[PDB]
Each structure stands twice: as structure tokens, then as C-alpha cells.
Ligand binder design. Structure first.
Ligand SMILES: *Cc1ccc(S(=O)(=O)Nc2ccn(C)n2)cc1
Ligand SMILES: *Cc1ccc(S(=O)(=O)Nc2ccn(C)n2)cc1
Ligand SMILES: [Cl-]
Ligand SMILES: [Cl-]
Ligand SMILES: [Cl-]
Ligand SMILES: [Cl-]
Lengths: 9, 229, 229, 9
């Protein structure tokens, strides 16, 4: 199950 | 932190650190920027979140490797000791983020976009604490995550359209909380389905660029439903 | 460093850190193991080298990103300041490794396999210093790299077969030194070609497993020759 | 030009 990756911005 | 550096320089250097994939530096720069005491813009909130998500993401991945090795050995003290070291470092990063939210990002966040963003962050970092919790406070940690996510959900339902990317990412992560932490797979599935369907019905209102933003997160909801059903 | 932890525990934890991709931890554990003062086995030398190669490899990649941004801006002080910060941290890691080799890994290394391994390491970390050097000591740093690689070459030619993986990796990296640092592309090409041809002619002596080890590094020599010619 | 990767062992 994936949470929002949220590792690029 | 970083009290002698200008706020704008900290922000500029956080962006450079992201480019250099130096996420620990990035997080320290954004921590310094927060501690300047001014509210954060939309872009600045994203920098803060990206930095710490990367740092704790590497710690979580390491903790899982070591926890797996430790569980195999239980079928000297070094594996347990080193898992504890990583676990303690991970908890310290979560406490640091939670401390930034509590002093004083959340109380100064009046707009829906900022308040929901920070409360989602609060739920996420309590969720990370819950992933490693095993003692007398596991339940209290889980409830702190649930409470933060729930307050963010309540605001996002009242104040944001069903396609808003923050509203969607919040619902995605709260559904992961239900499935992975709270042992409530049916709640997880129901939340992801209702979230996806209500966004689908609102897509007609969006520009091409907003449509791309929303459908990308809708795909993550669908990917989870595929795995869960 | 890590003076209260057992040598065997440091080694065990270095292996766990590699599994968890925690290379900074890995390097600190191996630094502690070295500082116990006993010589290192073949496997322990590899752990030391893997740990620091990963740490400095991430720093070099970051420095290159930032140096590129800085050169574009020269066609406020933040980009230069942050490149300097990363550069200083990289130099400190190289100095730390060089200090371990000098106190006292190299002087206690009598066998060809250990002495050549450490001298190759010495050439590598002076090469990394040379990549960022720009001042009055660039030339001296380059000469320190050259001298270390040359002493390792002399020993490896006398004491190891032409297919020995350390001998091959040494020649590969010395050829990269010639091409990238010393502005001697013809020397780089000649060294890589002669190294590849002499290994090819010795492959008939090897077992299946040693053949795989040697041909893998020979392919890296060939890849460079393809790029250089 | 690649040096030996040397990042896994
Ligand atoms: C919690 C959350 C943070 C950022 C966003 S975003 O602005 O839409 N960026 C994004 C979207 C999808 N992914 C993988 N990142 C949404 C939610
Ligand atoms: C300098 C050097 C270190 C290790 C080795 S190895 O033992 O043969 N491991 C290896 C071989 C090829 N690669 C990419 N790693 C050789 C040389
Ligand atoms: Cl430990
Ligand atoms: Cl406000
Ligand atoms: Cl800086
Ligand atoms: Cl010896």
C-alpha cells in the first residue's frame, strides 16, 4: 500500500 | 536553528539541496526557515514536507530491513542494538517535525490550504511513530495520528473541492493509516473508493493542468484499491 | 572512535548498515574497527572501502550538481556558499580515510594483497581531493595521488597475476586518474589497453568463478576505451 | 569514464 510519495518538489 | 542565516537564503539553499539530493541538509535549512517565525508559503510548505519525507523515508526503509533481520534471528545483541539506534534516530526526526508543527506552524495556519497541509503532516509523522511503536503508548500514538487526520479531513471536506490534490493526498494517507496501522481495512477501502468517485465526478471542472494533478493522485488511490480488493 | 564497542560488533554492525543502505553508519563502524589497531582481513578491507566509497560518492555527486549550478550563475553568495559547505565536508571525509591509511593501515600491510589495496585507496582519495582542488596545492595533491597509484602498480606488477581483481581495479582507476585529473589521455588509453590485453592472455589459468571476477572488471576497462577512442 | 563502482560488498 502506497502513501503519497511526496519526495520530489 | 541556523539563526544567523537569512530566511531567504535558507529557502534558496533548501532548493539547492533538493537538486543535489542532500535531503538532510534540505531539512535542516527548512527547519531554520520555519524557526524564523513567519508563516510559510505554498511552495515553502512543500519544501519542508519534501525534505522531511525523504529523510524519514530513508530511516523507515532502513528500520524495516533491520526489523526483518531481527525477526529472523528470533525464530548476540547487535541486530537489536542497531535497529534500536536507527529507530531512536527516526523517532527524533518525527519529534522534530511534530515540534515544528506545534511551535507554531499549525496555530498560525488560518487558511484551509495551510491548515489541512500541516494537519496531514501531523497525522503522517504520528503514523511513522506508530509504525515502530510497541509499548504502553502505541495506542495513544495511533489516536494522535487518527485525530490529526480526522481534523484535516473535516476541514478539507468543508473547504476544498473533491479534486484538490492536498485533499486527495490526505485521504490517500488516511486510508493507508486505516489499512496499515488501525487494522481497519474496510474503512481504508471505503475511504479510498468514496474519495476516488467524488474526485472523478468533479474532474469536469478542471483545467488541463489541474486535471493532471488530480488524476495522478487518483491513480494512487486506485493502485491501493487494486492491492486491497 | 566507537572505543567502547567490541571489534567484532563493529564489523557485524557495518555489515548490517550495508544491508540497510546506511553508508555513513557503515563508515563510522569501520572507522571504529580500524582504530582498534589490528590489521584488517580481506573481507574487512572491502567493508571499509565500500563504506567510504559510498559516502564520498554521494558527496561527489552533490558537489558536481552544485558546481554546475555555480558555473552557470557566473556566465547572491548562496550557491557558492553551499558548494563550499559540501566541498568542505567531502574534503573532511577524504582526510579521514587518508588518516586511517596513514595511521596505521599502510605501514602494517606486508602482504601484496593488503598493501596494494590500501595504496589504491590512498590514490583514490587524493584523486577525490584533486577533483575539487583549485589552489596552491592542486599540483601537490595530484602528485600525491600519482605517487600512491604508482607504488601500488609497481607492487601489483611484481606480486600479483595480471587477472587479479585488485590489480585490475587499480589499473582502471589509475587510468581514470590519467584521463580525468592528469590531462594525460594517451597514458590513460595505453594503460587500459595493456591492462586488458595482459589479463585476456591470463584468463585461461582461472576457474569459472575467478574468470567471472576478472572479466567483469575487464569490461569496465573496455567501456572506458570505447568512450576514449 | 568510470572508475570501479566499488559500492557493493
Ligand atoms: C500530501 C500532499 C502533498 C503534496 C501534494 S502535490 O502538490 O499535489 N504533489 C504530488 C502529487 C502527487 N504526488 C506523488 N506528489 C499532494 C498531497
Ligand atoms: C579496487 C577494487 C576493489 C574491489 C574489487 S573486487 O573484489 O573484485 N569487487 C568488484 C569487482 C568489480 N566491481 C565493480 N567490484 C576490485 C577492485
Ligand atoms: Cl548500534
Ligand atoms: Cl495566519
Ligand atoms: Cl551553506
Ligand atoms: Cl602486517
Amino acid at each position: 500500500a502506497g502513501s503519497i510519495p511526496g519526495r520530489r518538489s | 536553528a541556523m539563526g544567523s542565516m537569512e530566511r531567504a537564503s535558507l529557502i534558496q539553499k533548501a532548493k539547492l539541496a533538493e537538486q543535489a539530493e542532500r535531503y538532510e541538509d534540505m531539512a535542516a535549512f527548512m527547519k531554520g526557515a520555519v524557526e524564523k517565525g513567519e508563516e510559510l508559503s505554498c511552495e515553502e510548505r512543500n519544501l519542508l514536507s519534501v525534505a522531511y519525507k525523504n529523510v524519514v523515508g530513508g530511516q523507515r526503509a532502513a528500520w524495516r530491513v533491520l526489523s526483518s533481520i531481527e525477526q529472523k534471528s528470533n525464530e548476540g545483541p547487535e541486530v537489536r542494538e542497531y535497529r534500536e539506534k536507527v529507530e531512536t534516530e527516526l523517532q527524533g526526526v518525527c519529534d522534530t517535525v511534530l515540534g515544528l508543527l506545534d511551535s507554531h506552524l499549525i496555530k498560525e495556519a488560518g487558511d484551509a490550504e495551510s491548515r489541512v497541509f500541516y494537519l496531514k503532516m501531523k497525522g503522517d509523522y504520528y503514523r511513522y511513530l506508530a509504525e515502530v511503536a510497541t509499548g504502553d503508548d502505541k495506542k495513544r500514538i495511533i489516536d494522535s495520528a487518527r485525530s490529526a487526520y480526522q481534523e484535516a479531513m473535516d476541514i478539507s471536506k468543508k473547504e476544498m473541492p473533491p479534486t484538490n490534490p492536498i485533499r486527495l493526498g490526505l485521504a490517500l494517507n488516511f486510508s493507508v493509516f486505516h489499512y496499515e496501522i488501525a487494522n481497519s481495512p474496510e474503512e481504508a477501502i471505503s475511504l479510498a473508493k468514496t474519495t476516488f468517485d467524488e474526485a472523478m465526478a468533479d474532474l469536469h471542472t478542471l483545467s488541463e493542468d489541474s486535471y493532471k494533478d488530480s488524476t495522478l493522485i487518483m491513480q494512487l488511490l486506485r493502485d491501493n484499491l487494486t492491492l486491497w480488493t
